Amino acid sequence: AGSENIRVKNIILSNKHDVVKPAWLLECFKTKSFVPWQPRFMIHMCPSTKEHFAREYDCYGDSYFIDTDL
Amino acid sequence: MERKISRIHLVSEPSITHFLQVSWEKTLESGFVITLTDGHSAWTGTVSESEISQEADDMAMEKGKYVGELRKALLSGAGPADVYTFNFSKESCYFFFEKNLKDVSFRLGSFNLEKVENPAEVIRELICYCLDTIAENQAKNEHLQKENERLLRDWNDVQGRFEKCVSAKEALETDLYKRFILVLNEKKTKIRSLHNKLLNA
Amino acid sequence: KEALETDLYKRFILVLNEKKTKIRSLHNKLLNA
């Protein structure tokens, strides 16, 4: 959901699903590959995904193992 | 203390100009002293508050309006469209000025001046006043020009410095970002090395 | 200029502090294993 409407807010209230910005599909189409998620695209995190990205990524978009660009 | 010198064309002999100097303390309302000259002989007269008030009352005019009209006529305050005609009967020593209004003339003021025995003194005083005022004006103009030149130079310098600063702003921003990414990549390498060592252990 | 510099430096030192906390935790847990 690219617009945080009432449905998006209701899904946010429940912690059983993950929201991703529509740019993820466009990026997949351009690369024609199943690229994994990034904190920039997603606006919400499930507890499992939150734990998964906590190890790989930091409290913000910055990560540890993968370098960063401008 | 103020004084104004003006040029006039007497209708009796409208070929040679005359010069009239009128001096007042604060405003023409209280009074003033007038002196007419032509380069050979001069006449002088004075107008007081009582005389001007009586003349205005005879005119059935507001004091402010009469004072303004007198200032316009005597201080060379010519308006966009207005002609004033002056004439001085020498035999009767009577000088009066009127406001010509396109074939209807309205006499504005009239006085009786006394022929001063010594015209040389008044001419010399007028010349001295003119020289003093021109010297003062020249000094003021020189000072103002110097100040303007200095201010223009300072403004040019400040504008150049501002251009340099705005140009360097982007360079500073990009240098800061580059340094940021350098140190961040160093920290990423450090964390990667620590993770690899932990995995090996 | 001053506002931009201070804001950028504050953000950067915050990020550096977080990364330093993470590396300190990694070093602390390295000793036990």
UniProtKB/Swiss-Prot annotation, chain A:
| Parent-protein residues present | 702 to 771 of 911
Q: What protein name is recorded for this chain?
A: DNA ligase 4
> What compartments host this protein?
Nucleus
Gene name of the record: LIG4
The organism's place on the tree of life at top rank = Eukaryota
The family this protein is said to belong to: Belongs to the ATP-dependent DNA ligase family.
User: Where does tissue-level expression of this protein occur?
Assistant: Testis, thymus, prostate and heart.
**Annotated disorder:** LIG4 syndrome: Characterized by immunodeficiency and developmental and growth delay. Patients display unusual facial features, microcephaly, growth and/or developmental delay, pancytopenia, and various skin abnormalities. Severe combined immunodeficiency autosomal recessive T-cell-negative/B-cell-negative/NK-cell-positive with sensitivity to ionizing radiation: A form of severe combined immunodeficiency, a genetically and clinically heterogeneous group of rare congenital disorders characterized by impairment of both humoral and cell-mediated immunity, leukopenia, and low or absent antibody levels. Patients present in infancy with recurrent, persistent infections by opportunistic organisms.
How does this polypeptide assemble, per the annotation? Interacts with XRCC4; the LIG4-XRCC4 subcomplex has a 1:2 stoichiometry and XRCC4 is required for LIG4 stability. Component of the core long-range non-homologous end joining (NHEJ) complex (also named DNA-PK complex) composed of PRKDC, LIG4, XRCC4, XRCC6/Ku70, XRCC5/Ku86 and NHEJ1/XLF. Additional component of the NHEJ complex includes PAXX. Following autophosphorylation, PRKDC dissociates from DNA, leading to formation of the short-range NHEJ complex, composed of LIG4, XRCC4, XRCC6/Ku70, XRCC5/Ku86 and NHEJ1/XLF. Interacts with DCLRE1C; the interaction is direct. Interacts with APLF.
Taxonomic lineage: Eukaryota, Metazoa, Chordata, Craniata, Vertebrata
From Swiss-Prot, chain B:
Q: What is the effect of changing residue 99 to E?
A: Abolished interaction with NHEJ1/XLF. Abolished ability to bridge DNA. Abolished ability to bridge DNA
Tissue expression as described in the entry: Widely expressed.
Q: Name one GO cellular component term.
A: nonhomologous end joining complex
Effect ascribed to mutating residue 102 to E: Abolished interaction with NHEJ1/XLF
Query: Mutating residue 170 to A: what's the consequence?
Result: Abolished DNA-binding
Mutagenesis or variant effect for residue 55 to R: Abolished interaction with NHEJ1/XLF
Instruction: Indicate the segments annotated as coiled coil, or none if absent.
Output: 131-165, 184-201
Q: Could you state what the record's PTM comment says about this protein?
A: Phosphorylations by PRKDC at the C-terminus of XRCC4 and NHEJ1/XLF are highly redundant and regulate ability of the XRCC4-NHEJ1/XLF subcomplex to bridge DNA. Phosphorylation by PRKDC does not prevent interaction with NHEJ1/XLF but disrupts ability to bridge DNA and promotes detachment from DNA. Monoubiquitinated.
Phosphoserine modified-residue sites: 53, 193
Q: List the subcellular locations.
A: Nucleus; Chromosome
Q: Name one GO biological process term.
A: positive regulation of ligase activity
Q: Does the keyword field hold DNA repair?
A: yes
Q: Name one GO molecular function term.
A: FHA domain binding
Q: Which family does it belong to?
A: Belongs to the XRCC4-XLF family. XRCC4 subfamily.
Entry protein name: DNA repair protein XRCC4
Q: What does UniProt list as this organism's lineage? A: Eukaryota, Metazoa, Chordata, Craniata, Vertebrata
Q: Which gene encodes it?
A: XRCC4
From Swiss-Prot, chain C:
Where expressed (tissue)?
A: Widely expressed.
The regions listed as transmembrane in this protein's record are: none
The known PTMs are summarized as: Phosphorylations by PRKDC at the C-terminus of XRCC4 and NHEJ1/XLF are highly redundant and regulate ability of the XRCC4-NHEJ1/XLF subcomplex to bridge DNA. Phosphorylation by PRKDC does not prevent interaction with NHEJ1/XLF but disrupts ability to bridge DNA and promotes detachment from DNA. Monoubiquitinated.
The domain of life is Eukaryota
Which parts of this chain are annotated as the region Interaction with LIG4?
A: 12-33
Q: Give the subcellular location.
A: Nucleus; Chromosome
- Indicate the segments annotated as coiled coil, or none if absent: 16-33
Residues bearing the modification Phosphoserine: 25
Q: Describe the family membership recorded for this protein in Swiss-Prot or TrEMBL.
A: Belongs to the XRCC4-XLF family. XRCC4 subfamily.
Q: Which disease is it linked to?
A: Short stature, microcephaly, and endocrine dysfunction: A disease characterized by short stature and microcephaly apparent at birth, progressive postnatal growth failure, and endocrine dysfunction. In affected adults endocrine features include hypergonadotropic hypogonadism, multinodular goiter, and diabetes mellitus. Variable features observed in some patients are progressive ataxia, and lymphopenia or borderline leukopenia.
- What is the official name of this protein in its record? DNA repair protein XRCC4
Q: Where is the organism placed in the taxonomic lineage, from the top?
A: Eukaryota, Metazoa, Chordata, Craniata, Vertebrata
